[PDB]
């Protein structure tokens, strides 16, 4: 499967619930590697509560409800757990993810 950095998918978090997820790993590895590095997404909040958060508008990106990407919550998973590709985020939204990630991992 061709996953791109910026793609958001549903992921299966079972041993064989389902939660949204944001691919953040480089595209070379996203092709020739079994694993993908992702960043969780939740809808229990609608506003950022940290400089490591990026807001997602529901209507703009086809979500049922407003959500927030959690760049403090990152992990590498098997790509096979990626099922439905919900959307893709533009360069604008990914510049936010970038600076939130550098803060989270002290690349500042």
């Amino acid at each position: 499967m061709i996953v791109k950095r910026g793609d958001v998918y549903f992921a299966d978090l079972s041993p064989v619930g389902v939660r949204p997820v944001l691919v953040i790993q480089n595209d070379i590895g996203n092709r020739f590697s079994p694993t993908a590095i992702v960043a969780a997404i939740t809808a229990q909040i609608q506003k950022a509560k940290l400089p490591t958060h990026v807001e997602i508008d529901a209507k703009r990106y086809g979500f049922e409800r407003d959500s927030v990407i959690l760049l403090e919550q990152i992990r590498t998973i098997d790509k096979q757990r990626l099922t439905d590709k919900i959307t893709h985020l533009d360069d604008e939204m990914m510049d936010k993810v970038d600076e939130a990630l550098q803060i989270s991992l002290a690349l500042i």
């Binding site: 992921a11 041993p15 939660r19 909040i45 940290l50 959690l70 403090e72 919550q73 998973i77």
Partner: protein, 78 residues
């Protein structure tokens, strides 16, 4: 550079300030400006550190839950 204003410093503090000026070969404004920057940077930084703590502490219930709910996926990708 931009805005311009009016202050009242103690007579001793300015006398001392000119001391460090005559020595480091700079002007009053170059020194006052540098001093305001340092102070404001110091305050902004500390404020931000305090907002980060407060946020992390508010997010504990969520971040913990979802760290567990995706534990197995992590362990398999090992």
């Amino acid at each position: 550079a931009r805005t311009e204003m009016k202050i009242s410093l103690p007579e001793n503090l300015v006398a001392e300030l000119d001391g460090v000026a005559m020595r480091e070969k700079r002007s009053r404004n170059e020194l006052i400006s540098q001093a305001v920057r340092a102070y404001v940077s110091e305050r902004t930084t500390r404020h931000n550190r305090d907002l980060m703590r407060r946020g992390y502490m508010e997010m504990a219930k969520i971040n913990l839950n979802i760290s567990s709910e995706a534990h197995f996926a992590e362990c398999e990708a090992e």
